[PDB]
């Protein structure tokens, strides 16, 4: 699950939403989703899930971005999809270049201790993934 405060870029509108607003308001935004061959695409959100309060760890990436998610949440890394909790400083995760919109990989600079927060998940059509805080993760 993804933590409240998690920013999601909508490639169609160019707008960035906080995941809790998307869920509580059932907003049919589009996200940047990742396909199997390292290609990114725009995909609509068709379902919204409020996961309640849970512990979320933080992954601080090169550039400053920090994605907060439950330790079981899947993240795309240089070595494939792995649960956030298995990640450590030095590991590289998939990110979307703020400018080029291209897929690249960035180093995890620090792993932060857990903190309490409402958590969520979305259903992204077909590709079931999205870019959160610039990082590619499971929906």
* Contacts with 25 (C-beta within 8 Å, 6 or more apart), sequence order: none
Among candidate residues 134, 42, 125, 55, the one with its CA nearest the CA of residue 94: 134
Q: What whole-number distance in Å separates Cα of residue 120 and Cα of residue 23?
A: 7
- In this structure, are residues 50 and 24 in contact, taking their beta carbons and an 8 Å threshold? yes
How was this structure determined? It was done by X-ray
Using left for φ > 0, alpha for ψ between -120 and 50, and beta otherwise, residue 96 falls in beta
> Resolution in A, one decimal?
1.8
Count other Cβ atoms within 10 Å, centred on residue 131: 24
Q: What whole-number distance in Å separates Cα of residue 26 and Cα of residue 48?
A: 6
- Write down all domains in the chain, each with its CATH number in brackets: 1-139 (2.170.16.10)
86 secondary structure, DSSP code: G
Residue 29: both structure tokens together: 């935004």
Q: What whole-number distance in Å separates Cα of residue 101 and Cα of residue 105?
A: 13
Among candidate residues 25, 92, 28, 89, the one with its CA nearest the CA of residue 57: 89
């Amino acid at each position: 699950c993804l933590a409240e405060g998690t920013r999601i870029f909508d490639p169609v509108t160019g707008t960035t939403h906080r995941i809790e607003d998307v869920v509580d308001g059932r907003k049919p935004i589009h996200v940047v989703a990742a396909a199997k061959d390292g290609t990114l695409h725009a995909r609509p959100v068709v379902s919204w899930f409020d996961q309640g309060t849970r512990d979320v760890i933080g992954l601080r990436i090169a550039g400053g971005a920090i994605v907060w998610a439950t330790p079981d949440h899947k993240v795309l890394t240089e070595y494939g999809w792995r649960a956030a909790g298995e990640l450590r400083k030095g590991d590289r995760v998939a990110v979307r270049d703020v400018e080029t919109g291209e897929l690249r990989y960035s180093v995890i600079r620090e792993v932060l201790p857990t903190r309490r927060a409402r958590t969520f998940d979305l259903e992204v059509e077909e590709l079931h993934t999205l870019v959160a805080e610039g990082v590619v993760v499971h929906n």
